[PDB]
Amino acid sequence: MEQRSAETRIVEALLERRRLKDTDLVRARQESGMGLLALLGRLGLVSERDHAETCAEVLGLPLVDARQLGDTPPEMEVQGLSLRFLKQFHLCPVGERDGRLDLWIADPYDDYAIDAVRLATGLPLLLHVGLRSEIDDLIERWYG
Ligand SMILES: C[As](C)(=O)[O-]
């Protein structure tokens, strides 16, 4: 159906909301490997909060914060996700309710990562956007 990419719509919304300066965006254009929004985050040009916010607006997804998560994992399995994978992709299973896996995710526009999670777990997902470092903190607190 194919109108514009989720990343493109997020970048456009960052500009329009003035969470990103057009001068900064023009300077950003690879090469660590690095997606555009990744590079903006790494150059210090978009805050984690405004990244999360905008991802949530564009994709219509709920936002979840660190107040909402307890000190140890809730219960449930969950297969196919190594601790390393969680850390690399910055996402974290946080619960299972009505036959769906609640997944806290930094980069909900990344269809490669999501399709990886869908295939590895074999579970239907419910995506919740979280600030990158908050997800990282929970992964470590809950594991390693
Ligand atoms: C470890 As889980 C599926 O119960 O957040």
mmCIF file with all atom_site columns, N, CA and C in Angstrom, residues 24-94:
data_model
loop_
_atom_site.group_PDB
_atom_site.id
_atom_site.type_symbol
_atom_site.label_atom_id
_atom_site.label_alt_id
_atom_site.label_comp_id
_atom_site.label_asym_id
_atom_site.label_entity_id
_atom_site.label_seq_id
_atom_site.pdbx_PDB_ins_code
_atom_site.Cartn_x
_atom_site.Cartn_y
_atom_site.Cartn_z
_atom_site.occupancy
_atom_site.B_iso_or_equiv
_atom_site.pdbx_formal_charge
_atom_site.auth_seq_id
_atom_site.auth_comp_id
_atom_site.auth_asym_id
_atom_site.auth_atom_id
_atom_site.pdbx_PDB_model_num
ATOM 1   N N  . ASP A 1 24 ? 20.777 19.964  11.515 1.00 0.00 ? 24 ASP A N  1
ATOM 2   C CA . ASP A 1 24 ? 21.277 18.708  12.032 1.00 0.00 ? 24 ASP A CA 1
ATOM 3   C C  . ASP A 1 24 ? 20.950 17.493  11.147 1.00 0.00 ? 24 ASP A C  1
ATOM 4   N N  . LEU A 1 25 ? 19.755 17.501  10.580 1.00 0.00 ? 25 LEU A N  1
ATOM 5   C CA . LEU A 1 25 ? 19.315 16.371  9.791  1.00 0.00 ? 25 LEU A CA 1
ATOM 6   C C  . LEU A 1 25 ? 20.148 16.324  8.544  1.00 0.00 ? 25 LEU A C  1
ATOM 7   N N  . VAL A 1 26 ? 20.401 17.477  7.919  1.00 0.00 ? 26 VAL A N  1
ATOM 8   C CA . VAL A 1 26 ? 21.216 17.500  6.684  1.00 0.00 ? 26 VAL A CA 1
ATOM 9   C C  . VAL A 1 26 ? 22.646 17.011  6.951  1.00 0.00 ? 26 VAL A C  1
ATOM 10  N N  . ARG A 1 27 ? 23.222 17.357  8.097  1.00 0.00 ? 27 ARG A N  1
ATOM 11  C CA . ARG A 1 27 ? 24.546 16.830  8.433  1.00 0.00 ? 27 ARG A CA 1
ATOM 12  C C  . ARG A 1 27 ? 24.530 15.302  8.613  1.00 0.00 ? 27 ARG A C  1
ATOM 13  N N  . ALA A 1 28 ? 23.558 14.793  9.358  1.00 0.00 ? 28 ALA A N  1
ATOM 14  C CA . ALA A 1 28 ? 23.366 13.352  9.493  1.00 0.00 ? 28 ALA A CA 1
ATOM 15  C C  . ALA A 1 28 ? 23.091 12.725  8.099  1.00 0.00 ? 28 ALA A C  1
ATOM 16  N N  . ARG A 1 29 ? 23.866 11.697  7.771  1.00 0.00 ? 29 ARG A N  1
ATOM 17  C CA . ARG A 1 29 ? 23.731 10.844  6.554  1.00 0.00 ? 29 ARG A CA 1
ATOM 18  C C  . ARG A 1 29 ? 24.928 9.864   6.597  1.00 0.00 ? 29 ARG A C  1
ATOM 19  N N  . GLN A 1 30 ? 24.703 8.648   7.098  1.00 0.00 ? 30 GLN A N  1
ATOM 20  C CA . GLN A 1 30 ? 25.796 7.771   7.489  1.00 0.00 ? 30 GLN A CA 1
ATOM 21  C C  . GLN A 1 30 ? 27.141 8.533   7.608  1.00 0.00 ? 30 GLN A C  1
ATOM 22  N N  . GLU A 1 31 ? 27.793 6.344   9.193  1.00 0.00 ? 31 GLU A N  1
ATOM 23  C CA . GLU A 1 31 ? 28.256 5.216   8.388  1.00 0.00 ? 31 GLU A CA 1
ATOM 24  C C  . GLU A 1 31 ? 28.921 4.203   9.288  1.00 0.00 ? 31 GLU A C  1
ATOM 25  N N  . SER A 1 32 ? 28.272 3.912   10.419 1.00 0.00 ? 32 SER A N  1
ATOM 26  C CA . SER A 1 32 ? 28.865 3.053   11.460 1.00 0.00 ? 32 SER A CA 1
ATOM 27  C C  . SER A 1 32 ? 28.428 1.625   11.161 1.00 0.00 ? 32 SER A C  1
ATOM 28  N N  . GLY A 1 33 ? 27.115 1.482   11.085 1.00 0.00 ? 33 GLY A N  1
ATOM 29  C CA . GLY A 1 33 ? 26.430 0.819   9.987  1.00 0.00 ? 33 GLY A CA 1
ATOM 30  C C  . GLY A 1 33 ? 25.315 1.829   9.825  1.00 0.00 ? 33 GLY A C  1
ATOM 31  N N  . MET A 1 34 ? 24.332 1.643   10.694 1.00 0.00 ? 34 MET A N  1
ATOM 32  C CA . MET A 1 34 ? 23.551 2.724   11.255 1.00 0.00 ? 34 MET A CA 1
ATOM 33  C C  . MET A 1 34 ? 22.442 3.284   10.382 1.00 0.00 ? 34 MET A C  1
ATOM 34  N N  . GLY A 1 35 ? 21.225 2.964   10.795 1.00 0.00 ? 35 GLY A N  1
ATOM 35  C CA . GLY A 1 35 ? 20.040 3.611   10.257 1.00 0.00 ? 35 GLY A CA 1
ATOM 36  C C  . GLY A 1 35 ? 20.076 5.119   10.493 1.00 0.00 ? 35 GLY A C  1
ATOM 37  N N  . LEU A 1 36 ? 19.199 5.842   9.822  1.00 0.00 ? 36 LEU A N  1
ATOM 38  C CA . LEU A 1 36 ? 19.182 7.299   9.951  1.00 0.00 ? 36 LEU A CA 1
ATOM 39  C C  . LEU A 1 36 ? 18.813 7.677   11.381 1.00 0.00 ? 36 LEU A C  1
ATOM 40  N N  . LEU A 1 37 ? 17.748 7.086   11.925 1.00 0.00 ? 37 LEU A N  1
ATOM 41  C CA . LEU A 1 37 ? 17.305 7.509   13.245 1.00 0.00 ? 37 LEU A CA 1
ATOM 42  C C  . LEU A 1 37 ? 18.330 7.122   14.349 1.00 0.00 ? 37 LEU A C  1
ATOM 43  N N  . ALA A 1 38 ? 18.881 5.935   14.205 1.00 0.00 ? 38 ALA A N  1
ATOM 44  C CA . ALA A 1 38 ? 20.115 5.489   14.943 1.00 0.00 ? 38 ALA A CA 1
ATOM 45  C C  . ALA A 1 38 ? 21.237 6.499   14.895 1.00 0.00 ? 38 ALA A C  1
ATOM 46  N N  . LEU A 1 39 ? 21.555 7.037   13.727 1.00 0.00 ? 39 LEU A N  1
ATOM 47  C CA . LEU A 1 39 ? 22.683 7.942   13.588 1.00 0.00 ? 39 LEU A CA 1
ATOM 48  C C  . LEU A 1 39 ? 22.380 9.264   14.299 1.00 0.00 ? 39 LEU A C  1
ATOM 49  N N  . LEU A 1 40 ? 21.154 9.777   14.108 1.00 0.00 ? 40 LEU A N  1
ATOM 50  C CA . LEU A 1 40 ? 20.669 10.952  14.830 1.00 0.00 ? 40 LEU A CA 1
ATOM 51  C C  . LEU A 1 40 ? 20.737 10.807  16.324 1.00 0.00 ? 40 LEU A C  1
ATOM 52  N N  . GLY A 1 41 ? 20.370 9.646   16.840 1.00 0.00 ? 41 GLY A N  1
ATOM 53  C CA . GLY A 1 41 ? 20.494 9.394   18.247 1.00 0.00 ? 41 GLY A CA 1
ATOM 54  C C  . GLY A 1 41 ? 21.965 9.396   18.671 1.00 0.00 ? 41 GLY A C  1
ATOM 55  N N  . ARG A 1 42 ? 22.827 8.809   17.833 1.00 0.00 ? 42 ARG A N  1
ATOM 56  C CA . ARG A 1 42 ? 24.243 8.632   18.190 1.00 0.00 ? 42 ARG A CA 1
ATOM 57  C C  . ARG A 1 42 ? 25.000 9.952   18.081 1.00 0.00 ? 42 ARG A C  1
ATOM 58  N N  . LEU A 1 43 ? 24.600 10.835  17.161 1.00 0.00 ? 43 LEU A N  1
ATOM 59  C CA . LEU A 1 43 ? 25.163 12.171  17.070 1.00 0.00 ? 43 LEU A CA 1
ATOM 60  C C  . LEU A 1 43 ? 24.615 13.159  18.141 1.00 0.00 ? 43 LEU A C  1
ATOM 61  N N  . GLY A 1 44 ? 23.746 12.692  19.023 1.00 0.00 ? 44 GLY A N  1
ATOM 62  C CA . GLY A 1 44 ? 23.127 13.540  20.032 1.00 0.00 ? 44 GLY A CA 1
ATOM 63  C C  . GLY A 1 44 ? 22.068 14.539  19.514 1.00 0.00 ? 44 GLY A C  1
ATOM 64  N N  . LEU A 1 45 ? 21.499 14.271  18.356 1.00 0.00 ? 45 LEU A N  1
ATOM 65  C CA . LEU A 1 45 ? 20.629 15.253  17.735 1.00 0.00 ? 45 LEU A CA 1
ATOM 66  C C  . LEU A 1 45 ? 19.144 15.042  17.972 1.00 0.00 ? 45 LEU A C  1
ATOM 67  N N  . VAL A 1 46 ? 18.764 13.851  18.435 1.00 0.00 ? 46 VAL A N  1
ATOM 68  C CA . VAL A 1 46 ? 17.359 13.564  18.798 1.00 0.00 ? 46 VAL A CA 1
ATOM 69  C C  . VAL A 1 46 ? 17.441 12.886  20.140 1.00 0.00 ? 46 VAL A C  1
ATOM 70  N N  . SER A 1 47 ? 16.743 13.409  21.129 1.00 0.00 ? 47 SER A N  1
ATOM 71  C CA . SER A 1 47 ? 16.700 12.744  22.441 1.00 0.00 ? 47 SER A CA 1
ATOM 72  C C  . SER A 1 47 ? 15.975 11.396  22.406 1.00 0.00 ? 47 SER A C  1
ATOM 73  N N  . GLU A 1 48 ? 16.348 10.509  23.339 1.00 0.00 ? 48 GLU A N  1
ATOM 74  C CA . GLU A 1 48 ? 15.636 9.246   23.473 1.00 0.00 ? 48 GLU A CA 1
ATOM 75  C C  . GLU A 1 48 ? 14.172 9.431   23.696 1.00 0.00 ? 48 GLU A C  1
ATOM 76  N N  . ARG A 1 49 ? 13.795 10.422  24.517 1.00 0.00 ? 49 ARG A N  1
ATOM 77  C CA . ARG A 1 49 ? 12.404 10.709  24.717 1.00 0.00 ? 49 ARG A CA 1
ATOM 78  C C  . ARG A 1 49 ? 11.636 11.097  23.446 1.00 0.00 ? 49 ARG A C  1
ATOM 79  N N  . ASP A 1 50 ? 12.207 11.985  22.640 1.00 0.00 ? 50 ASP A N  1
ATOM 80  C CA . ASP A 1 50 ? 11.564 12.456  21.432 1.00 0.00 ? 50 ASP A CA 1
ATOM 81  C C  . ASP A 1 50 ? 11.572 11.363  20.357 1.00 0.00 ? 50 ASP A C  1
ATOM 82  N N  . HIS A 1 51 ? 12.610 10.530  20.347 1.00 0.00 ? 51 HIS A N  1
ATOM 83  C CA . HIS A 1 51 ? 12.613 9.333   19.498 1.00 0.00 ? 51 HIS A CA 1
ATOM 84  C C  . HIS A 1 51 ? 11.409 8.443   19.827 1.00 0.00 ? 51 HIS A C  1
ATOM 85  N N  . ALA A 1 52 ? 11.313 8.014   21.076 1.00 0.00 ? 52 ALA A N  1
ATOM 86  C CA . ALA A 1 52 ? 10.191 7.179   21.562 1.00 0.00 ? 52 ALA A CA 1
ATOM 87  C C  . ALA A 1 52 ? 8.841  7.823   21.262 1.00 0.00 ? 52 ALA A C  1
ATOM 88  N N  . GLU A 1 53 ? 8.704  9.090   21.667 1.00 0.00 ? 53 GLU A N  1
ATOM 89  C CA . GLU A 1 53 ? 7.470  9.812   21.424 1.00 0.00 ? 53 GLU A CA 1
ATOM 90  C C  . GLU A 1 53 ? 6.933  9.797   20.017 1.00 0.00 ? 53 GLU A C  1
ATOM 91  N N  . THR A 1 54 ? 7.849  10.093  19.097 1.00 0.00 ? 54 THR A N  1
ATOM 92  C CA . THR A 1 54 ? 7.518  10.201  17.721 1.00 0.00 ? 54 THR A CA 1
ATOM 93  C C  . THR A 1 54 ? 7.202  8.835   17.097 1.00 0.00 ? 54 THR A C  1
ATOM 94  N N  . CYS A 1 55 ? 8.019  7.818   17.412 1.00 0.00 ? 55 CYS A N  1
ATOM 95  C CA . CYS A 1 55 ? 7.726  6.448   17.009 1.00 0.00 ? 55 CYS A CA 1
ATOM 96  C C  . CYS A 1 55 ? 6.289  6.091   17.430 1.00 0.00 ? 55 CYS A C  1
ATOM 97  N N  . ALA A 1 56 ? 5.917  6.423   18.651 1.00 0.00 ? 56 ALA A N  1
ATOM 98  C CA . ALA A 1 56 ? 4.600  6.096   19.148 1.00 0.00 ? 56 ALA A CA 1
ATOM 99  C C  . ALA A 1 56 ? 3.488  6.838   18.426 1.00 0.00 ? 56 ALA A C  1
ATOM 100 N N  . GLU A 1 57 ? 3.682  8.124   18.139 1.00 0.00 ? 57 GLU A N  1
ATOM 101 C CA . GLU A 1 57 ? 2.711  8.884   17.377 1.00 0.00 ? 57 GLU A CA 1
ATOM 102 C C  . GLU A 1 57 ? 2.546  8.322   16.038 1.00 0.00 ? 57 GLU A C  1
ATOM 103 N N  . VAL A 1 58 ? 3.622  8.012   15.343 1.00 0.00 ? 58 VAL A N  1
ATOM 104 C CA . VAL A 1 58 ? 3.479  7.693   13.942 1.00 0.00 ? 58 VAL A CA 1
ATOM 105 C C  . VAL A 1 58 ? 2.851  6.345   13.794 1.00 0.00 ? 58 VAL A C  1
ATOM 106 N N  . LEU A 1 59 ? 3.174  5.456   14.725 1.00 0.00 ? 59 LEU A N  1
ATOM 107 C CA . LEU A 1 59 ? 2.747  4.066   14.596 1.00 0.00 ? 59 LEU A CA 1
ATOM 108 C C  . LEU A 1 59 ? 1.480  3.778   15.423 1.00 0.00 ? 59 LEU A C  1
ATOM 109 N N  . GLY A 1 60 ? 0.999  4.746   16.206 1.00 0.00 ? 60 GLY A N  1
ATOM 110 C CA . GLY A 1 60 ? -0.194 4.559   17.005 1.00 0.00 ? 60 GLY A CA 1
ATOM 111 C C  . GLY A 1 60 ? -0.027 3.582   18.147 1.00 0.00 ? 60 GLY A C  1
ATOM 112 N N  . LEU A 1 61 ? 1.205  3.444   18.650 1.00 0.00 ? 61 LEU A N  1
ATOM 113 C CA . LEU A 1 61 ? 1.500  2.437   19.637 1.00 0.00 ? 61 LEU A CA 1
ATOM 114 C C  . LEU A 1 61 ? 1.560  3.105   20.996 1.00 0.00 ? 61 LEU A C  1
ATOM 115 N N  . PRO A 1 62 ? 1.268  2.327   22.021 1.00 0.00 ? 62 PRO A N  1
ATOM 116 C CA . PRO A 1 62 ? 1.366  2.826   23.390 1.00 0.00 ? 62 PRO A CA 1
ATOM 117 C C  . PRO A 1 62 ? 2.815  3.015   23.827 1.00 0.00 ? 62 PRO A C  1
ATOM 118 N N  . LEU A 1 63 ? 2.984  3.913   24.773 1.00 0.00 ? 63 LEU A N  1
ATOM 119 C CA . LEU A 1 63 ? 4.242  4.233   25.395 1.00 0.00 ? 63 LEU A CA 1
ATOM 120 C C  . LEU A 1 63 ? 4.213  3.660   26.824 1.00 0.00 ? 63 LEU A C  1
ATOM 121 N N  . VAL A 1 64 ? 5.319  3.012   27.227 1.00 0.00 ? 64 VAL A N  1
ATOM 122 C CA . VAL A 1 64 ? 5.431  2.371   28.529 1.00 0.00 ? 64 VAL A CA 1
ATOM 123 C C  . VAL A 1 64 ? 6.733  2.862   29.148 1.00 0.00 ? 64 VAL A C  1
ATOM 124 N N  . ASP A 1 65 ? 6.687  3.114   30.448 1.00 0.00 ? 65 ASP A N  1
ATOM 125 C CA . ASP A 1 65 ? 7.861  3.591   31.136 1.00 0.00 ? 65 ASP A CA 1
ATOM 126 C C  . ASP A 1 65 ? 8.210  2.694   32.275 1.00 0.00 ? 65 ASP A C  1
ATOM 127 N N  . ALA A 1 66 ? 9.402  2.989   32.798 1.00 0.00 ? 66 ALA A N  1
ATOM 128 C CA . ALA A 1 66 ? 10.095 2.224   33.789 1.00 0.00 ? 66 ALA A CA 1
ATOM 129 C C  . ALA A 1 66 ? 9.367  2.113   35.141 1.00 0.00 ? 66 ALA A C  1
ATOM 130 N N  . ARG A 1 67 ? 8.489  3.075   35.445 1.00 0.00 ? 67 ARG A N  1
ATOM 131 C CA . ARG A 1 67 ? 7.636  2.974   36.643 1.00 0.00 ? 67 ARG A CA 1
ATOM 132 C C  . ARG A 1 67 ? 6.760  1.777   36.516 1.00 0.00 ? 67 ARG A C  1
ATOM 133 N N  . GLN A 1 68 ? 6.414  1.398   35.279 1.00 0.00 ? 68 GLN A N  1
ATOM 134 C CA . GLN A 1 68 ? 5.415  0.321   35.078 1.00 0.00 ? 68 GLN A CA 1
ATOM 135 C C  . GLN A 1 68 ? 5.948  -1.131  35.178 1.00 0.00 ? 68 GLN A C  1
ATOM 136 N N  . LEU A 1 69 ? 7.259  -1.280  35.314 1.00 0.00 ? 69 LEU A N  1
ATOM 137 C CA . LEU A 1 69 ? 7.900  -2.585  35.370 1.00 0.00 ? 69 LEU A CA 1
ATOM 138 C C  . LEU A 1 69 ? 8.480  -2.886  36.773 1.00 0.00 ? 69 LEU A C  1
ATOM 139 N N  . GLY A 1 70 ? 8.148  -4.043  37.348 1.00 0.00 ? 70 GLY A N  1
ATOM 140 C CA . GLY A 1 70 ? 8.708  -4.499  38.625 1.00 0.00 ? 70 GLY A CA 1
ATOM 141 C C  . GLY A 1 70 ? 10.175 -4.929  38.567 1.00 0.00 ? 70 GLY A C  1
ATOM 142 N N  . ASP A 1 71 ? 10.708 -5.395  39.702 1.00 0.00 ? 71 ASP A N  1
ATOM 143 C CA . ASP A 1 71 ? 12.139 -5.707  39.881 1.00 0.00 ? 71 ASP A CA 1
ATOM 144 C C  . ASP A 1 71 ? 12.644 -7.022  39.275 1.00 0.00 ? 71 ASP A C  1
ATOM 145 N N  . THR A 1 72 ? 11.743 -7.965  39.091 1.00 0.00 ? 72 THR A N  1
ATOM 146 C CA . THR A 1 72 ? 12.060 -9.230  38.447 1.00 0.00 ? 72 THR A CA 1
ATOM 147 C C  . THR A 1 72 ? 10.984 -9.557  37.442 1.00 0.00 ? 72 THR A C  1
ATOM 148 N N  . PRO A 1 73 ? 11.300 -10.429 36.482 1.00 0.00 ? 73 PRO A N  1
ATOM 149 C CA . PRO A 1 73 ? 10.344 -10.776 35.418 1.00 0.00 ? 73 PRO A CA 1
ATOM 150 C C  . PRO A 1 73 ? 9.036  -11.365 35.952 1.00 0.00 ? 73 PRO A C  1
ATOM 151 N N  . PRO A 1 74 ? 7.909  -10.992 35.352 1.00 0.00 ? 74 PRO A N  1
ATOM 152 C CA . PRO A 1 74 ? 6.590  -11.370 35.857 1.00 0.00 ? 74 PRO A CA 1
ATOM 153 C C  . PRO A 1 74 ? 6.323  -12.865 35.973 1.00 0.00 ? 74 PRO A C  1
ATOM 154 N N  . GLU A 1 75 ? 6.547  -13.690 34.949 1.00 0.00 ? 75 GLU A N  1
ATOM 155 C CA . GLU A 1 75 ? 6.173  -15.117 35.035 1.00 0.00 ? 75 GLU A CA 1
ATOM 156 C C  . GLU A 1 75 ? 6.259  -15.888 33.705 1.00 0.00 ? 75 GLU A C  1
ATOM 157 N N  . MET A 1 76 ? 5.320  -15.576 32.816 1.00 0.00 ? 76 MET A N  1
ATOM 158 C CA . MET A 1 76 ? 4.850  -16.503 31.790 1.00 0.00 ? 76 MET A CA 1
ATOM 159 C C  . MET A 1 76 ? 4.139  -17.695 32.441 1.00 0.00 ? 76 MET A C  1
ATOM 160 N N  . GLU A 1 77 ? 6.611  -19.734 28.335 1.00 0.00 ? 77 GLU A N  1
ATOM 161 C CA . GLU A 1 77 ? 8.068  -19.701 28.249 1.00 0.00 ? 77 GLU A CA 1
ATOM 162 C C  . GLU A 1 77 ? 8.714  -18.304 28.172 1.00 0.00 ? 77 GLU A C  1
ATOM 163 N N  . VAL A 1 78 ? 9.634  -18.265 27.197 1.00 0.00 ? 78 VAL A N  1
ATOM 164 C CA . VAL A 1 78 ? 9.724  -17.395 25.976 1.00 0.00 ? 78 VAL A CA 1
ATOM 165 C C  . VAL A 1 78 ? 10.989 -17.917 25.272 1.00 0.00 ? 78 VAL A C  1
ATOM 166 N N  . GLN A 1 79 ? 10.859 -18.437 24.056 1.00 0.00 ? 79 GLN A N  1
ATOM 167 C CA . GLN A 1 79 ? 11.965 -19.075 23.334 1.00 0.00 ? 79 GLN A CA 1
ATOM 168 C C  . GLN A 1 79 ? 12.551 -18.178 22.302 1.00 0.00 ? 79 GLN A C  1
ATOM 169 N N  . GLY A 1 80 ? 13.806 -18.445 22.002 1.00 0.00 ? 80 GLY A N  1
ATOM 170 C CA . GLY A 1 80 ? 14.403 -18.009 20.776 1.00 0.00 ? 80 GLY A CA 1
ATOM 171 C C  . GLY A 1 80 ? 15.051 -16.681 20.880 1.00 0.00 ? 80 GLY A C  1
ATOM 172 N N  . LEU A 1 81 ? 14.987 -16.016 22.043 1.00 0.00 ? 81 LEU A N  1
ATOM 173 C CA . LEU A 1 81 ? 15.611 -14.709 22.249 1.00 0.00 ? 81 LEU A CA 1
ATOM 174 C C  . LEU A 1 81 ? 16.738 -14.824 23.259 1.00 0.00 ? 81 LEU A C  1
ATOM 175 N N  . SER A 1 82 ? 17.956 -14.634 22.787 1.00 0.00 ? 82 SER A N  1
ATOM 176 C CA . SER A 1 82 ? 19.092 -14.683 23.681 1.00 0.00 ? 82 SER A CA 1
ATOM 177 C C  . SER A 1 82 ? 19.176 -13.339 24.374 1.00 0.00 ? 82 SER A C  1
ATOM 178 N N  . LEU A 1 83 ? 19.875 -13.332 25.506 1.00 0.00 ? 83 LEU A N  1
ATOM 179 C CA . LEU A 1 83 ? 20.132 -12.061 26.196 1.00 0.00 ? 83 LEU A CA 1
ATOM 180 C C  . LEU A 1 83 ? 20.819 -11.088 25.279 1.00 0.00 ? 83 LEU A C  1
ATOM 181 N N  . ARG A 1 84 ? 21.795 -11.594 24.483 1.00 0.00 ? 84 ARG A N  1
ATOM 182 C CA . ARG A 1 84 ? 22.511 -10.774 23.539 1.00 0.00 ? 84 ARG A CA 1
ATOM 183 C C  . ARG A 1 84 ? 21.577 -10.102 22.518 1.00 0.00 ? 84 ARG A C  1
ATOM 184 N N  . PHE A 1 85 ? 20.680 -10.866 21.928 1.00 0.00 ? 85 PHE A N  1
ATOM 185 C CA . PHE A 1 85 ? 19.693 -10.366 20.975 1.00 0.00 ? 85 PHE A CA 1
ATOM 186 C C  . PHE A 1 85 ? 18.906 -9.198  21.605 1.00 0.00 ? 85 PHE A C  1
ATOM 187 N N  . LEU A 1 86 ? 18.374 -9.405  22.795 1.00 0.00 ? 86 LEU A N  1
ATOM 188 C CA . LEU A 1 86 ? 17.692 -8.292  23.511 1.00 0.00 ? 86 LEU A CA 1
ATOM 189 C C  . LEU A 1 86 ? 18.507 -7.009  23.567 1.00 0.00 ? 86 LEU A C  1
ATOM 190 N N  . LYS A 1 87 ? 19.783 -7.158  23.948 1.00 0.00 ? 87 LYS A N  1
ATOM 191 C CA . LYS A 1 87 ? 20.685 -6.022  24.040 1.00 0.00 ? 87 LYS A CA 1
ATOM 192 C C  . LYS A 1 87 ? 21.001 -5.411  22.696 1.00 0.00 ? 87 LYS A C  1
ATOM 193 N N  . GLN A 1 88 ? 21.276 -6.215  21.677 1.00 0.00 ? 88 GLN A N  1
ATOM 194 C CA . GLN A 1 88 ? 21.556 -5.668  20.377 1.00 0.00 ? 88 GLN A CA 1
ATOM 195 C C  . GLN A 1 88 ? 20.373 -4.915  19.795 1.00 0.00 ? 88 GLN A C  1
ATOM 196 N N  . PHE A 1 89 ? 19.172 -5.464  19.954 1.00 0.00 ? 89 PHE A N  1
ATOM 197 C CA . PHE A 1 89 ? 17.996 -4.836  19.290 1.00 0.00 ? 89 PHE A CA 1
ATOM 198 C C  . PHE A 1 89 ? 17.258 -3.823  20.193 1.00 0.00 ? 89 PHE A C  1
ATOM 199 N N  . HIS A 1 90 ? 17.643 -3.812  21.482 1.00 0.00 ? 90 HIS A N  1
ATOM 200 C CA . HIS A 1 90 ? 17.063 -2.943  22.530 1.00 0.00 ? 90 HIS A CA 1
ATOM 201 C C  . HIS A 1 90 ? 15.582 -3.189  22.614 1.00 0.00 ? 90 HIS A C  1
ATOM 202 N N  . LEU A 1 91 ? 15.199 -4.423  22.920 1.00 0.00 ? 91 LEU A N  1
ATOM 203 C CA . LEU A 1 91 ? 13.782 -4.716  23.103 1.00 0.00 ? 91 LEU A CA 1
ATOM 204 C C  . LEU A 1 91 ? 13.757 -5.854  24.157 1.00 0.00 ? 91 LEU A C  1
ATOM 205 N N  . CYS A 1 92 ? 12.626 -6.063  24.774 1.00 0.00 ? 92 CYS A N  1
ATOM 206 C CA . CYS A 1 92 ? 12.520 -6.897  25.975 1.00 0.00 ? 92 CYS A CA 1
ATOM 207 C C  . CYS A 1 92 ? 11.104 -7.437  26.203 1.00 0.00 ? 92 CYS A C  1
ATOM 208 N N  . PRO A 1 93 ? 10.903 -8.749  26.265 1.00 0.00 ? 93 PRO A N  1
ATOM 209 C CA . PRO A 1 93 ? 9.604  -9.261  26.616 1.00 0.00 ? 93 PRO A CA 1
ATOM 210 C C  . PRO A 1 93 ? 9.280  -8.859  28.069 1.00 0.00 ? 93 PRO A C  1
ATOM 211 N N  . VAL A 1 94 ? 8.079  -8.346  28.292 1.00 0.00 ? 94 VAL A N  1
ATOM 212 C CA . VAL A 1 94 ? 7.682  -7.866  29.641 1.00 0.00 ? 94 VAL A CA 1
ATOM 213 C C  . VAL A 1 94 ? 6.443  -8.517  30.236 1.00 0.00 ? 94 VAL A C  1
#
